[PDB]
Design a protein around this ligand. Structure first.
Ligand SMILES: CC(C)CCC[C@@H](C)[C@H]1CC[C@H]2[C@@H]3CC=C4C[C@@H](OC(=O)CCC(=O)O)CC[C@]4(C)[C@H]3CC[C@]12C
Ligand SMILES: CC(C)CCC[C@@H](C)[C@H]1CC[C@H]2[C@@H]3CC=C4C[C@@H](OC(=O)CCC(=O)O)CC[C@]4(C)[C@H]3CC[C@]12C
Ligand SMILES: CC(C)CCC[C@@H](C)[C@H]1CC[C@H]2[C@@H]3CC=C4C[C@@H](OC(=O)CCC(=O)O)CC[C@]4(C)[C@H]3CC[C@]12C
Ligand SMILES: CC(C)CCC[C@@H](C)[C@H]1CC[C@H]2[C@@H]3CC=C4C[C@@H](OC(=O)CCC(=O)O)CC[C@]4(C)[C@H]3CC[C@]12C
Ligand SMILES: CC(C)CCC[C@@H](C)[C@H]1CC[C@H]2[C@@H]3CC=C4C[C@@H](OC(=O)CCC(=O)O)CC[C@]4(C)[C@H]3CC[C@]12C
Ligand SMILES: CC(C)CCC[C@@H](C)[C@H]1CC[C@H]2[C@@H]3CC=C4C[C@@H](OC(=O)CCC(=O)O)CC[C@]4(C)[C@H]3CC[C@]12C
Ligand SMILES: CC(C)CCC[C@@H](C)[C@H]1CC[C@H]2[C@@H]3CC=C4C[C@@H](OC(=O)CCC(=O)O)CC[C@]4(C)[C@H]3CC[C@]12C
Ligand SMILES: FC(F)(F)c1ccccc1-c1cc(C(F)(F)F)c2[nH]c(C3=NOC4(CCCCC4)C3)nc2c1
Ligand SMILES: FC(F)(F)c1ccccc1-c1cc(C(F)(F)F)c2[nH]c(C3=NOC4(CCCCC4)C3)nc2c1
Lengths: 566, 103, 52
């Protein structure tokens, strides 16, 4: 029956008295995987494992190869076998038997998602996508039922790690498969919030705890509800307070940077600049630690690259400015420091994506780049045309690159917001800024006919500039506004779901670290370098309840009346 | 505003040493650039001086850094693009985004 | 000078051809296509503006 794909007969055999646990035997599984494995599917799996690979792809490939060649978790192997050959009903039937199912469902969805892209067939890709969506919905519904029934056991199940199913929890698989919907559900968000506040109660007003951060003695009093001296350690170990402290430290670092840059910058650095160098050194140490924890994947994110560039720019500025003898180098170092200051200051937008009020709006900015690009494309085309035409008709043989580019591009660009593109388009006023020769740093003069009268006709220039201004300054901006409005309306319903994923990423990254306040984390890193079952049963019970719920919902059609009529 | 003002002031003048004018240049002018006027007339070397003050005695902005001779030392190829980007961002994109969110 | 002016106008005409050729980019093409549908709004705007 398994060979012939008879799901109903398989279910009947299982439920009528067959012992599946005893059924699955080493010889049986070897004979099943060695030969009945589709050769096409075998080759596709080998190609996928060899080329793309992943934390679970290699595991499943190794298990398959081991079984073909010759705890145990055989039921999981059978479920994998059923899934890999695209058997919907048989896969569900086998899934109904596994002890751990939510993890199994998430892993199956991940496997289908990674295997669907490779396949060239459109119809097969669509079928696999539909199956993956079905399994995702199954997992979401099951976990919602479990959390609604019991909360602490649901959180424990989340924390529970498999014994080499994939070596990962449900959270890790869901995030790896970018399953936004599963994490966006209330249970996972509440778990992340509880982990975020740490010891502190989640019901406390946020302003109370923010106020207590500054004044230490206020923490000893009963203002903070610690229950969800020992209070100090329980408070300063909370990642929320560590994050707030780091934000304060970063703001103070920006203030010091600006003060040194504008108010106190001399040939020989003074004490404040040395303190600034020390702060940048601790930031660089943190960046090096972050490099160590991750691989080259860490450089696939824009903000990380920006931070690395800022640090390298700071080092370059240090290098340039140590030549106190030469004045021409101190200014260059200061300019490098100014650019690095811009880079550092832009980091606040990244760090403040967690505020729960600004974060979603910041996230949605990434979705308007196509509208911006179209706007810039039209603007650039129009600027090029107008500038070239105007320059050609007005002055002749410019012969200076900087002023060709100044007239052709810069002035039409300035015409976008306010001032009319050219005061030379009108003969009413001209000269006293002209230069017949190129010796001076002024625009080339207008072409002149006999006498000193300008030769260009106004009846072709004035309409040109009028049309250009009417187009750029009004129509295009309004079109941009309309496109932005439509995009916001479309993407608002999904922005919050997308933002919750990044919130999880934060609430995991900050909690993973040792949680030491930023100013003196160096000591921690230095001396670390010196030092450098029951839940599954409950899951099955809840799965049985959920399956019975599905069956009752199906039977709620009330069509049995006609059958009883017959 | 903070980023642009700090960068521009740092590259252009040196050691300001007067709080009211540090704050006037860093914040007030970029803020005025939101509605209309270009943030800085000093970004371009085509016109300068006659409003400068080498010393702080008068109530005028501090002069621009000077190299050998009286020529300004700041390069335009980093200032002009900076101001262009800042204006394109604040004056147009942000206002339209605000309109969309209000709608 | 007249020939140069004619060349400038012809340059404008040629440069406007990029918008036509780039209607196939799969990102800009749809937005370029939709421009043809706002001419009535532009016309009403211009009518009121001219009267005033
Ligand atoms: C020490 C001096 C030089 C700086 C004084 C400026 C203050 C106005 C700044 C400094 C630290 C800032 C605070 C740092 C962290 C936060 C938490 C933030 O809310 C959250 O991040 C909550 C996260 C969540 O909801 O999950 C709201 C602003 C606040 C109080 C910031 C608001 C403005 C503060 C008080
Ligand atoms: C003035 C110059 C010479 C030095 C630069 C100082 C900056 C570090 C200050 C100036 C303006 C300040 C900001 C004004 C507005 C905000 C947003 C504000 O965001 C929130 O509080 C989020 C609240 C929520 O979402 O719940 C936090 C303070 C911050 C970054 C302030 C703190 C730091 C800034 C950039
Ligand atoms: C060579 C001269 C012009 C000086 C160069 C210094 C700045 C003008 C550079 C340094 C970092 C650059 C920024 C790096 C990242 C971005 C975000 C980008 O917009 C987005 O990517 C939105 C989506 C997202 O959130 O990532 C627009 C340009 C900007 C501000 C870049 C524009 C130019 C900046 C400010
Ligand atoms: C085509 C649409 C999208 C916008 C057109 C805007 C109108 C306001 C333009 C169209 C024709 C233009 C006119 C065409 C010719 C002239 C003569 C010109 O006066 C001259 O100097 C002509 C040359 C000479 O001195 O003999 C002053 C502008 C005016 C009225 C132009 C001003 C603005 C007008 C009415
Ligand atoms: C990046 C996007 C979001 C906006 C860019 C706007 C453009 C209109 C900028 C990009 C590069 C800029 C140009 C970069 C360099 C120069 C040379 C500059 O002339 C100089 O004085 C250079 C220094 C010297 O005198 O030698 C005049 C402006 C121009 C054409 C800049 C004017 C405006 C440009 C084309
Ligand atoms: C500078 C003067 C003296 C000479 C004129 C040169 C032009 C031919 C250059 C200047 C600006 C350039 C444009 C800046 C922006 C764009 C849009 C861009 O469109 C895309 O890449 C579509 C991408 C996608 O949709 O996937 C292609 C390059 C183009 C036409 C660039 C190529 C040609 C332009 C018009
Ligand atoms: C006699 C003087 C004013 C000089 C004439 C030269 C230009 C001002 C002329 C030459 C070609 C004309 C353009 C030919 C086509 C169009 C598209 C038109 O808008 C649309 O048709 C949108 C729908 C579409 O995509 O076809 C607006 C005017 C414009 C730019 C015309 C306006 C005036 C242009 C640029
Ligand atoms: F939002 C927008 F796009 F404005 C627009 C919105 C709604 C309806 C039409 C338009 C539109 C479209 C185009 C086109 F799609 F055809 F490009 C336009 N082209 C021009 C001009 N062409 O050349 C000029 C600049 C160079 C000098 C000669 C005049 C202005 N104005 C347009 C208006
Ligand atoms: F509505 C808006 F936000 F404009 C916007 C709307 C739609 C798409 C993108 C943006 C956007 C986003 C950001 C970011 F989210 F990344 F912050 C921007 N940042 C900047 C600049 N950064 O620095 C500058 C000022 C300081 C001097 C250097 C230049 C301008 N322009 C942005 C445009």
């Amino acid at each position: 029956a398994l060979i012939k794909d008879r799901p109903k007969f398989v279910r009947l055999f299982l439920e009528n008295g067959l012992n599946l646990q005893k059924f699955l035997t080493n010889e049986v599984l070897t004979e099943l995987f060695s030969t009945h494995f589709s050769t096409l599917v075998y080759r596709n799996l080998q190609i996928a494992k060899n080329s793309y690979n992943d934390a679970l792809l290699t595991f499943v490939w190794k298990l398959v190869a081991n079984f073909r060649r010759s705890t145990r978790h055989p039921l999981q192997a059978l479920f994998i076998w059923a899934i890999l050959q695209n058997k919907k009903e048989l896969s569900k039937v086998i899934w109904e038997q596994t002890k751990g199912c939510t993890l199994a469902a998430l892993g199956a969805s991940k496997l289908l998602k990674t295997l669907a892209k490779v396949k060239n067939d459109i119809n097969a890709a669509g079928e696999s996508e539909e199956l993956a969506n079905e399994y995702e919905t199954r997992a979401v519904e099951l976990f919602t039922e479990c959390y609604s029934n019991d909360e602490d056991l649901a959180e424990q199940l989340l924390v529970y790690s498999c014994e080499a199913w994939g070596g990962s929890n449900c959270l890790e698989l869901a995030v790896e498969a970018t399953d936004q919907h599963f994490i966006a559900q209330p249970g996972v968000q509440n778990f992340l919030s509880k982990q975020w506040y740490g010891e502190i109660s989640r019901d406390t007003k946020n302003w109370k705890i923010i106020l207590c951060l500054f004044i230490i003695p206020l923490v000893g009093c009963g203002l903070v509800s610690f229950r969800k001296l020992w209070y100090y350690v329980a408070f300063f170990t909370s990642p929320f307070v560590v994050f707030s402290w780091n934000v304060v430290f970063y703001i103070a670092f920006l203030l010091l940077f600006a003060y040194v840059l504008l108010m106190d910058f001399h040939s020989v650095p003074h004490t404040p600049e040395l303190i600034l160098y020390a702060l940048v050194f601790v930031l660089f140490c943190d960046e090096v630690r972050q490099w160590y924890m991750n691989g080259v994947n860490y450089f696939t994110d824009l903000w990380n690259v920006m931070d690395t560039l800022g640090l390298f720019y700071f080092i370059a500025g240090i290098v340039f400015r140590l030549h106190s003898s030469n004045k021409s180098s101190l200014y260059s170092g200061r300019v490098i420091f100014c650019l690095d200051y811009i880079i550092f200051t832009l980091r606040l937008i990244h760090i403040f994506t967690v505020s729960r009020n600004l974060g979603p709006k910041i996230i949605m900015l990434q979705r308007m780049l196509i509208d911006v690009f179209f706007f810039l494309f039209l603007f650039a085309v129009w600027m090029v045309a107008f500038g070239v035409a105007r320059q050609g008709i007005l002055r002749q043989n410019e012969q200076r690159w900087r002023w060709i580019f100044r007239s052709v591009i810069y002035e039409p660009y300035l015409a976008m917001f306010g001032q009319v593109p050219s005061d030379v388009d009108s003969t009413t006023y001209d000269f006293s800024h002209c230069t017949f020769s190129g010796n001076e740093s002024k625009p080339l003069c207008v072409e002149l006919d006999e006498h000193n009268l300008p030769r260009f006709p106004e009846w072709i220039t004035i309409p040109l500039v009028c049309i250009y201004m009417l187009s750029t300054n009004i129509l295009l901006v309004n079109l941009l506004v309309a496109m932005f409005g439509y995009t916001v309306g479309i993407v608002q319903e999904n922005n919050d779901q997308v933002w919750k994923f990044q919130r999880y990423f934060l609430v995991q990254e900050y909690c993973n670290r040792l949680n030491i306040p930023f100013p003196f984390v160096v000591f921690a890193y230095f001396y670390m370098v010196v030092k450098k079952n029951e839940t599954l049963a409950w899951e099955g019970v809840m799965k049985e309840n959920y399956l019975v719920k599905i069956n009752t919902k199906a039977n709620d059609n009330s069509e049995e009346m006609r059958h009883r009529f017959r």
